[PDB]
Symmetry: D2
Subunit: 363 residues, 4 copies
């Protein structure tokens, strides 16, 4: 990885702020002959914000709806007293002025959420490739908003059965909260409304599952699958934590119960595991089981409220309430988490298949 480039063999270099001309990316290394038009890319992008404004336009790498193998440029055109007096608390205004000596006049620029358009646009190509590869299914959903949280205990049979069956269509059918639990979601809609009248913001947690992942993906010792996934998710805006499998709470379970015993699958074709506390990754390598992980998103710093903060000139004052912002943007990161997971998987799949070729010729 390097700066605004993600991936090794399937690479995506992104660009763009909010108050510039356009935002997009360049996907390098896509396999040739893949059916690819803007219809394969808009649905995930059109899931980012729920005229059609944010519309992609493929710039290269395709001909007659099929990829050539050359870089694929994609873009969404940019429609776009207190400013620069205080750095907004818990925003990247001050760190940008320290690192770059200059920030965007407003809106935060590159640190904001508009940059993720390149992520989602590239992840749509990766998603289609993984479906052709092994029918990989990547579904994310909101499992927690503030104190209201799903029962995502990895040992709970009901939660594990949800991870095995949850689809992207079901997540979006429950409304904008994108929580598949009806009881928890109703508790969620009451807490986002409470923070809405309070002119506040609240954080959340996104849980995502990867099904039918090919075995053998991951590049120890540093580019392990769960390490590249953590790298991918923790690079998202406002993310504060990442865990997979049994996660943090699994450390309380002894090895006699935490260990995943092996068994030959009931369909009788492969060795599977009885339990999936490992989260589908063992020694940094996928074993074909379900890969599930949760990502913590902090509460939005931009609150519709007054704050006592010091200026850049560093004098104590009151940052006036801007007063126009939604209190829970965590469900808007569900497609970005899905897109980020697909980029990692297709990169590890191509690297591993290169080893599978070499393993076949030196044998």
């Amino acid at each position: 990885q390097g700066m605004s480039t993600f991936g090794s063999v399937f690479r995506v270099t992104t660009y763009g702020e909010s108050h510039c001309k356009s935002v997009g990316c360049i996907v390098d290394g896509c396999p040739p002959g893949l059916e690819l038009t803007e219809a394969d890319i808009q649905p995930q992008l059109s899931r980012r914000r729920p005229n059609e404004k944010d519309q992609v336009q493929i710039q290269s790498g395709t001909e007659h709806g099929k990829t050539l193998g050359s870089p694929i440029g994609m873009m969404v055109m940019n429609q776009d007293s207190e400013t620069d007096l205080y750095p907004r608390p818990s925003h990247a205004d001050w760190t940008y002025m320290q690192k770059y000596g200059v920030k965007s006049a407003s809106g935060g620029g590159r640190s904001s959420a508009r940059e993720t358009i390149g992520r989602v646009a590239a992840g749509a190509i990766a998603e289609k490739i993984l479906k052709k590869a092994n029918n990989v299914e990547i579904v994310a959903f909101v499992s927690s908003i503030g104190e209201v949280s799903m029962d995502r205990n990895p040992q709970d049979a009901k939660f594990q059965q949800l991870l095995n069956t949850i689809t992207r269509e079901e997540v979006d059918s429950v409304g904008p909260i994108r929580c598949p639990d009806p009881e928890v979601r109703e508790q969620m809609v009451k807490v986002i409304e409470k923070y809405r009248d309070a002119k506040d913001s609240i954080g959340g947690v996104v849980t995502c599952v990867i099904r039918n992942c090919p075995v053998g993906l991951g590049e120890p010792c540093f580019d392990k699958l769960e390490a590249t996934l953590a790298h991918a998710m923790m690079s998202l805006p406002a993310t504060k934590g990442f865990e997979f499998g049994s996660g943090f709470a699994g450390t309380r379970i002894p090895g006699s119960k935490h260990n995943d015993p092996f068994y030959f699958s009931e369909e009788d074709q492969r060795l599977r595991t009885k339990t999936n506390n490992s989260g589908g990754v063992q020694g940094g390598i996928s074993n074909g089981e379900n890969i599930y992980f949760s990502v913590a998103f902090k509460s939005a710093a931009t609150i519709s409220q007054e704050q006592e903060t010091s200026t850049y000139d560093g004098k104590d004052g009151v940052l006036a309430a801007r007063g126009r912002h939604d209190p829970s943007v965590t469900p808007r990161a569900v497609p970005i988490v899905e897109s980020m997971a697909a980029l990692v998987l297709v990169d590890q799949l191509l690297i591993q298949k290169s080893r599978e070729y070499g393993k076949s010729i030196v044998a």
Copy 2:
């Protein structure tokens, strides 16, 4: 990053298993003229396991105790019925046979903990550079073992004061548990003994703090500081999760309280933050505040107990108890977490200082 290479400008490529000849690494990009002998590298390595067996030997890149700027090779010499009948549950035996078609005859090989010698050896060079840079202090400690956990609430004043003052000497003075809390540590020594007689294993959580980190470190949008740190920690053996700042529990705090207001430091030289819920990183860039994070380590799969597992031939059987293993290896990852954090920081510091030069000439 790529496979067994970590870093961009300060790069370390590692190698080595347990049952091979040697284990070590090659550090590429170290600044010339740094006082460097094996005495700068052994202490952290000699903290990995608590004749002197694991002794490093610098192979190149130095002359008269000073670095030349060329690659620095370093090594520790390798002193080293049921085997290959079953893949050990929750171990990397099966995934290695699927990805590579072959595993080490025993001991797990590259997936085990011996590979981390290259990490610690390289991290010792990075640690010394960061001390010369801005007197950076990297201290890690065990904050949780199973159900026994420290009160690491990021809003707790006492815990924040511990992160501001805890030293590596104090962590090792409390014994092998490496928990600075005397009440919690005594509860820890009773739970590791309980799992010891039970012939079981238990997981834990390592908390680490970075002090005096230079402002401006981190490379958005993908190589953000907290993203490279998560990548670094989640690539370690047995790690199941990573969080920094307010982490997962911070998502329950509204923005009005979670936001970190700014203020001019009491020593009067810089703009600081009143609270540090951001964890010293904002928009993927360090702001000079304390960087604290916790890493979850699963319970060891190698238990001194019997397990019901299926063979590679995939027939149900009993994996006999090996019966010789310690039930809590989490405190052995404290120096590896410290070494992993130093490698990330020195890489981001060199990249950022290259931008600081360019910022000074185009101005």
Copy 3:
């Protein structure tokens, strides 16, 4: 480097064919605060082909004519019986069908010269940075066209004095041939006309000089300055060779005469060399002397003539004369060679200055 990405710290990822929507690049790692508009980028682009068709449009990374430090997207909009019967001899038609299984319907696509727009657009930013850095001057010119060649003997005093004084304005004042030698150029215009009536094509050689290059640039052992420059030039379309300094002909000179003795500069500030047979690079590191090199460009495969070739179906036939092409496109590569040299230099300069910082703190 990786596929369509060039550079380490100053990175450029390009994209685009001829028959697609647009062609351009993403420049990652540009220092913030640099005065940058399309006026800094069009002149070199407007030198590629000598309404204004090929006009760049900055997409991001700038605000109020200054760079922010974020990625900089740039683009030129694409205005754009025998086809697919034969692969055109010495073209990339057949290799594309073998590697990708598909080629562009016509025009060669990514293998053609339109891809170099991203190179030139990015090289313009690198050129301006190197001018602010140490007043670096990069001038290229045509020194050979077929059998007509300049007397570019590196030991010739007149040729060395030309390399020390030749400017980009003087190269373009002599006409489209871009050969600074008036006698040789008149011999050149007579040989391109001879091959024009013959409906043929002819190759050439481009010589380029870099002046005021900062000392210390280059990353041994693989990313040496002359190695990155060779990599940069040999990646251009139709290039068949690269040499620098004394080059191939210098191998005939014994070390007693080929060696460059040192001497303290006449301006009295630095140690210089009496002769420059090394070409300004020694051990892969720039010494501040003039860096001069020549690049061989083959004769264009697309000739306005008939050729006997086998089909994809592989039957002997006659490829009809297309009859519309210029016989000498070597002078059109002068700005691309300049742009390619600037990209290498600014990358090595930023890496080296990162080491100069580290050298200053560990001292």
Copy 4:
């Protein structure tokens, strides 16, 4: 590429000077299950200098003579009035003091030829893989020493027949000159002896051929096959130029004669080319034809003669004759050129085969 790391998927990170403890490398990404012991690696290393001193010792990545897929460490142990008064002319003494502020006390250190041990050790693994892949044959030989040069005209039928048949065994049977031409070699042995009595040094040119290279290798637009090969060869010590195919002299041939027509092979299985002026690469992609290239090596700077040079203190003086050095070291670079070519090819082969998998699933 990065500093002392070469390759993308098949990566080699080298280390080591002359006056250090050891020299070697770490090969990352080797396919598992390859028969590999020191006997596969010593022959090319034992061809570098023609007790057994320079003996490799595999440190990791193998078990029972087969590779595991983990990094492979390899090493050769280091047996090792005028010094530091003058920087030796045309040596890297001065540039090292400017870039690093320090050089090795003597011998040049990392800039010398001892670093190439890691290249040859890694190239031996790549060579064996390419033989299993498509029976790739890499043979290099000395074609020129000073003014004495072979008739390596690419259009000459006899020279092309030599490239098609020359073997590594035949090159070493003619003696240490490693020139397959008996008439030219006898003219070579007379010119190296002339410069030997003169206490001088002379340069040379190494020509290398790659046979049976798989079609489709090369990663446009920057990592084209001939670009990675030029990068690989120009990173070698003392190299001053690189050309492939028709090279520089081919620019004098019009396209009507320079173009390579296609034809279906006489063995009747594939489309081949009648002539090979392209050098087996077209558009940066291998077409399966012979890949031949020449590399220019300058005359050794270390001459057994007196030189007038300025000090580091920069006062005119006489550098005394060291008087112990061989006048023609170009034949010692034949195995290094072969090893360097194998590293490039196996990297491009693995990347391309990853695309061949992706091409097979999206189809």
